[PDB]
């Protein structure tokens, strides 16, 4: 046999192409939108203190 042993998190075969997925691909958009929200709030707060 070929001595390479693959390990997958979640694997499916959809359209002649094998597709995999880990545990963080689904959470990219909310995370990088939360970061933008915090960054935009910080400097707006820092612009006019009193």
């Amino acid at each position: 046999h070929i001595p390479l042993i693959p390990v997958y998190g979640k694997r499916w075969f959809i359209d002649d192409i094998e597709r995999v997925e880990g545990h963080i691909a689904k959470a990219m958009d909310p995370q990088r939108l939360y970061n933008l929200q915090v960054s935009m709030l910080a400097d707006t707060a820092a612009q006019d203190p009193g």
Partner: protein
């Protein structure tokens, strides 16, 4: 642009616009009024070096005297505004009062002058304000925290 705008032309425009010395009403013109107008224009530009700001007027070099044949150095886009302001300042020599339409024209021309000078200074960041880890201050840039000075 095109023809250079001399100092005497502005005062002649101001005198014409209120029917004091022009070929369209009765004519006539006096040299002392011209000298007074030119000196008024000089002093009014000197004052304008503060509130409206510099607009490129050319002052007399040494002691000398302004003279009406000297080049003003102003673009032709400003002559109406300058002339209306000068007329407003120098009307009271002849004991005359402006009419509402002249005031409206002067205000419109002055607003056009004001529009061509705005800056809107665009306030900065403070200086103790952090810059995030997304900016990668280790290697790409240096000096985490904004400079906020320069």
């Amino acid at each position: 642009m095109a023809t250079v705008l001399t100092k005497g032309e502005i005062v002649l425009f101001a005198l014409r616009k209120f029917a004091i010395a022009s070929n369209a009403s009765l004519t006539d013109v006096e040299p002392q009024s011209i000298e007074d107008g030119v000196n008024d224009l000089e002093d009014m530009m000197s004052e304008w070096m503060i509130n409206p700001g510099d607009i490129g007027y050319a002052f007399a070099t040494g002691d000398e005297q302004p003279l009406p044949d000297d080049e003003s150095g102003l673009p032709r886009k400003y002559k109406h505004a300058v002339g209306y302001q000068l007329l407003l300042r120098m009307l009271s020599d002849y004991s005359l009062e402006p009419t509402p339409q002249v005031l409206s024209n002067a205000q419109r021309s002055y607003d056009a002058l004001m529009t061509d000078t705005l800056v809107v200074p665009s306030m900065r960041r403070r200086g103790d304000f952090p810059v995030g880890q997304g900016n990668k201050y280790d290697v790409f840039t240096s000096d985490r925290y904004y400079p906020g000075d320069l």
